[PDB]
Structure formats: structure tokens, C-alpha cells
Amino acid sequence: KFIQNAAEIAKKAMDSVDPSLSEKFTIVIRFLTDNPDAASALKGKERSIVGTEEYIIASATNFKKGRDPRTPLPPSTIPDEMVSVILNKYFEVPSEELEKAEEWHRLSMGAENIVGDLLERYIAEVIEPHGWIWCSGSMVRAVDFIYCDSENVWQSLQVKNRDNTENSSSAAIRHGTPIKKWFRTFSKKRGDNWDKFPSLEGKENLSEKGFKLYVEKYLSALRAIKALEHHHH
Amino acid sequence: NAAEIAKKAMDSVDPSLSEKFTIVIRFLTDNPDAASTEEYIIASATNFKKGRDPRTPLPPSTIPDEMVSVILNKYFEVPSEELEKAEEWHRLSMGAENIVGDLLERYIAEVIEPHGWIWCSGSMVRAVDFIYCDSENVWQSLQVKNRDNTENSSSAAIRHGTPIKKWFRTFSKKRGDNWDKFPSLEGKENLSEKGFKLYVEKYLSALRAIKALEH
Ligand SMILES: [Ca+2]
Ligand SMILES: [Ca+2]
């Protein structure tokens, strides 16, 4: 459970980190004070116990960190040479393109491991104007977005990229409606699931085209950023 | 009489494995936490035999995420016309990855089973992949992994015997192989990264020839 002056801790913590996030973050802390089973230990920073002042202050940096752009990263795992032997000797992938196949495999795994994060970013850009809050970083378990609605009731939303997405999670809601759960894509079949995205202000904006346009924009911007890194060295 | 029940069950399924399967049932009778009544042993006999069937490399059945092609195109600059090719080679690489661990066991099985070790085929044995009853009747057990960080790992307690000799072929973070540290046992000398490559190429050559005659 949370300390006696949780909100005032949150405010000043995020004022040092990023003043534009302070209001939103303060509300996240209030949400976790009312709903403590959604509170999670911070990944990489587990030294601070869930609910203490030290956790609130560490959560502020974490919450902001979560919103910095991620670069699509192929894993640093050196590939198995026997994978290439199988591509060449069974699947008849030409021997001179084996190195290429190896790299695109790694890029494809890098693409896969950031799509979940970009989905949250897309959704956040659309629904944060209307008062919803993307719970960025790892301080919140199970819930990806929160909203204190016009009736002062906590709404909460979980998104997955796929229906068979690995990290399933649930947390108990002491005060609020049940967590709305939604997945973008099907593992069983082609197509998307935006039609059944839970009702909330701004919902009509959200779609697969919208998400595709967000991703083109985010990667274009990011490419341009890394171009400026080489000019600044 | 679990040994006699194990004998009969495997005589029904495949008599060529009845000797090896019985010794594995003896191993799980002494070390029941490695086990993954009479009906269990009948079921196991099929599982163990199934694990010895030649397995084809199969790309996953799964439907690709359309956004992966977009990220390949728009971040990593893979051309429009090559995206489908990239998608398919990714699927093929996963199917290759999904079988290398199996090919590794079969290779080791070919070498060390003639020296009285037994391949724990199928998934009836948790963690442990090979076993042996040494000259003084003690259970030596061996657990093989393709990579040091290989995605999933399942584990068991040794009740009676020496600890589980653990070993992996390749490293996640650096190039090369780890065959130099393979556990001491009869036939260790014939196991290498080159022996394995040759075994895989001959294995896949034979599969391709079978697939040619079928269609
Ligand atoms: Ca989730
Ligand atoms: Ca989350």
C-alpha cells in the first residue's frame, strides 16, 4: 500500500524530471493508491519497494524513460551456423544469400519486439488529448491506459498486439470498472480487431490504417534523428 | 513389476526400443521427479517411440504481422519487392531453429548409444536427454541444450545418482562452439562441431531424397 502524502511526492518528483508529465503522473499514482494490486516493482530498479517515497521518485524517471523513442533493435545473439546449413541444404536457399537471410531474420525479430511498444504509442497519441493516460514504463501491471471519467470512476485498458501474446496479466480493481482487454491481431487468421476496440472518447479515430500511418511517421522521424547523429558525430 | 510392464508395452509399439525403454523406466523409478501406474507406462512407450521418428523442418503455421514488413521497409530500408522474400526466410529460419535441438540429440544418439547410453526420446523425461547405468550401477545423466540461453528450460531433481551433467553447444554472445567441454563418457571423442555438421548435411540430404520420390 501507498504512503500518506503519495500525490505531493509524485508532483515534485516529475517536476524535476519533466514538468509536462507531472499532472498525468500524479493521476497514475492516485490510481495505484486506490488500486494497489496494479502497482508493480520497477524493472531494473527493484531496490525501491512498491509504495514508498523512493519508489514514487524512481517511478517518475521510469515513467518518462518509457516515453523516449525506442530504436528497432535486432538482437545481439550471434546466429547459429546450423540454421544456415538447414536453409541451404533442406530449404534450397542459395548459399550466397545465406548471410542476407541471417540478417533479415534478425531484423524481423527486431521489428517484432518493438511493434507492441509502437501500438501503445499510437494509441497514446490518439487518446491522451481526451484525458486518458498511457502508463509508460513498468510501474503499472496489467493496465496500459487509465482514465478518471466524467463520473470520477477509474477506467482502465490493457492492449496486446496478438491474441496469443506471451505476457498476459491481470490485476484486481478495488475502485473502478473491470479492466478492458483488447488485442490487435489474430494468431489463428489474417485481419485485425480494431472494430471491437472498447468504447471511449476518440475511439472512431483508431484503426489499422491509423496505426500504419503512425508507424511510418515514427520511423521516418527516427531515421531523420539518427541522420543528425552522424553529422553531430 | 514396472520393468516387465514397460517391456510388454514397448513390445506392442516397437520391439527394437524395448531394451532402451525398460532401462529408462528403471531410471524414472529411481528418480521420479524427472517423470513428465500401468497406464502411464503404456502412454510413455508411444511418446518415446514417436521422438525417434524422422522429423521434417517446418516453418511455423502462424500468420505474419503486416507491421513487421513495414518496419523492415521503412526503418531498415528493405525494398518493397524483397519484403515477401524476407518474410518467408524469417519463417524458414524459425523452422530451422525449431529443429536444430532435435538434430543435435539425434547426432549425439548416433554416437553414444552404441556405448550403452540411451537417448531419452520424446518428452517423457523432464530436462534429462541421455542416461547410463555405469559398471557400479549408478545413474549418470546428461542434459543437452543448443544455446547457453536456449529459449525454454525445464528441470528435475536427482534422487539417486550423480548430478545432471549439463552442456550446451553454442554461445549467445560470442562466435564458435563449446564441444571442448562435452562431458566425459564413452564416445565423447567422436563428438565435434564438424561431426554434427556432417550428420546434419547427410540427414537433410536423405530427407530431400525421400521428398523427391513422394512427389
Ligand atoms: Ca499487457
Ligand atoms: Ca504496460
Numbering used by the authors:
A (entry chain A): 4 to 236
B (entry chain B): 8 to 43, 55 to 233
Please share excerpts from the published article on this structure:
AvaII from the filamentous cyanobacterium Anabaena variabilis has attracted our interest because it exhibits robust activity against the RNA and DNA strands of an RNA/DNA heteroduplex. The core of the AvaII protomer adopts the same conformation in all three structures, and consists of the characteristic αββββ motif of the PD-(D/E)XK endonucleases.
AvaII was prepared for crystallization in the presence of 5 mM Ca2+ ions. The two open forms (in the absence of nucleic acids and in the scanning complex with the RNA/DNA duplex) are almost identical and no dynamic motions are found between them according to the DynDom server.
